[PDB]
Amino acid sequence: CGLVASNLNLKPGECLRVRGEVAPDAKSFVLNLGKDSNNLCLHFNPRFNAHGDANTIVCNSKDGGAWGTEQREAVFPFQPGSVAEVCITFDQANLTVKLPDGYEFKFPNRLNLEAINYMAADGDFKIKCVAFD
Amino acid sequence: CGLVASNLNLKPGECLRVRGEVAPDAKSFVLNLGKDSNNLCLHFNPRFNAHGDANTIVCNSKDGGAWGTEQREAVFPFQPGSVAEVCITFDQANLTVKLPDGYEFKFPNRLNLEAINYMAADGDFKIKCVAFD
Ligand SMILES: CC(=O)N[C@@H]1[C@@H](O[C@@H]2O[C@H](CO)[C@H](O)[C@H](O)[C@H]2O)[C@H](O)[C@@H](CO)O[C@H]1O
Ligand SMILES: CC(=O)N[C@@H]1[C@@H](O[C@@H]2O[C@H](CO)[C@H](O)[C@H](O)[C@H]2O)[C@H](O)[C@@H](CO)O[C@H]1O
């Protein structure tokens, strides 16, 4: 696995910023946010070439070990072999993810945790920088 | 406890940059670095006024759960209610903690691990930014 951080205590409205290097031959990377590995309010999974998907952002929740209903975006502002920054915040209704080119999407908040306490990165994304606001 | 990060994979010569908020009423804060919570190549513990120490940095190791022998500095460049930045690196001989204004603290490398994989903050220190170089 990649970087795992806990005790984040990220409250509604606070910004979590992650900057990393996307591998030149990247097939996929993951940012998981929530309470723990079984309880994710956001599974954020850009798929360059994985699970039969191409240049597709896949998002989901995981609640008590169970994947929720998957959602995808049409836009894919990531390139292999470049640096990517992602900024995440949430309120009780939605997570809001802002992407490098100013792209911003919302994913329903299905878990309604009081805070994001857990983040894990995986796959072809080398984290260089994590910041809190 | 404060932020805990694992799978850091920080190798010799690589630089861990941490910026945090020292609480206004700070009595003590901690940065722990090593393999896991029981194997610390550096316990970095500025004590403003705790355990009978005043404005003293206490450093130690922990090896398979057992604390080593404490090393202490006279020089104390931390202030309560402020922002502190440190840059940490290690080699075969020492861990080095550097502050921007040029303070440099060295602690013997007692564990000789291949990497720092674990970092944890505790006490009156709120981490706001972590970077890898
Ligand atoms: C179990 C399985 O393979 N599920 C398939 C999906 O792949 C998983 O998607 C989740 C997020 O929803 C995680 O990314 C997990 O790592 C993936 O294996 C796949 O996206 C969909 C659509 O093809 O099919 C599921 O069955
Ligand atoms: C159990 C205990 O209090 N040990 C004393 C030391 O305090 C601990 O020191 C370690 C680092 O070596 C950690 O900072 C831990 O949090 C502290 O409780 C204390 O520094 C010395 C002398 O002042 O005595 C030890 O027995």
Numbering used by the authors:
A (entry chain A), B (entry chain B): 2 to 134
Paper text:
Members of this family have been shown to participate in diverse biological functions, such as cell adhesion, cell growth regulation, and apoptosis via their interactions with β-galactoside-containing structures on cell surface, e.g., N-, O-linked glycoproteins, proteoglycans or glycolipids. All galectins are able to recognize Galβ1-3/4GlcNAc disaccharides, namely type 1 and 2 LacNAc (abbreviated as LN1 and LN2, respectively) that appear in a myriad of glycoconjugates. To bridge this gap, we herein report the crystal structures including full-length human galectin-1 (hGal1), galectin-7 (hGal7) and the C-terminal CRD domain of galectin-3 (hGal3-CRD) in complex with LN1.
While only one monomer exists in the asymmetric unit of hGal3-CRD co-crystal, each asymmetric unit of hGal1 and hGal7 harbors a distinct symmetric dimer. Specifically, the dimer of hGal1 exists in a side-by-side manner, whereas hGal7 dimer is present in a back-to-back arrangement. Generally, hGal1 and hGal3 appear to have shorter distances (in average) in H-bonds to both GAL and GlcNAc moieties of LN2 than those of LN1. First, hGal1 and 7 have the electrostatic network consisting of Arg48hGal1/53hGal7, Asp54hGal1/Glu58hGal7, Glu71hGal1/72hGal7 and Arg73hGal1/74hGal7. These residues adopt dissimilar conformations and orientations when interacting with LN1 or LN2 molecules, while the corresponding network of hGal3-CRD (Arg162, Glu165, Glu184 and Arg186) interacts either with LN1 or LN2 in almost the same manner. A water was hold by Asp54hGal1, Arg73hGal1 and the N2 atom of GlcNAc in the hGal1/LN2 complex via formation of H-bonds, whereas Glu165hGal3 and the N2 of GlcNAc were observed to clamp a water molecule in the hGal3/LN2 complex. The C5-hydroxyl group of LN1 (yellow sticks) in hGal1 and hGal3-CRD complexes makes close contact with the coordinated water in LN2-hGal1 andLN2-hGal3-CRD complex with a distance of 2.2 and 2.1 Å, respectively. Even Asp54hGal1 and Glu165hGal3 have a dissimilar location in L4, i.e. Asp54hGal1 is resided at the end of the β-turn structure in L4, while Glu165hGal3 appears as the first residue of the β-turn. Since Asp54hGal1 and Glu165hGal3 residues mediate ionic interactions to their adjacent Arg residues, apparently the location of Asp54hGal1 and Glu165hGal3 results in the distinct conformation of L4 in hGal1 and hGal3-CRD.
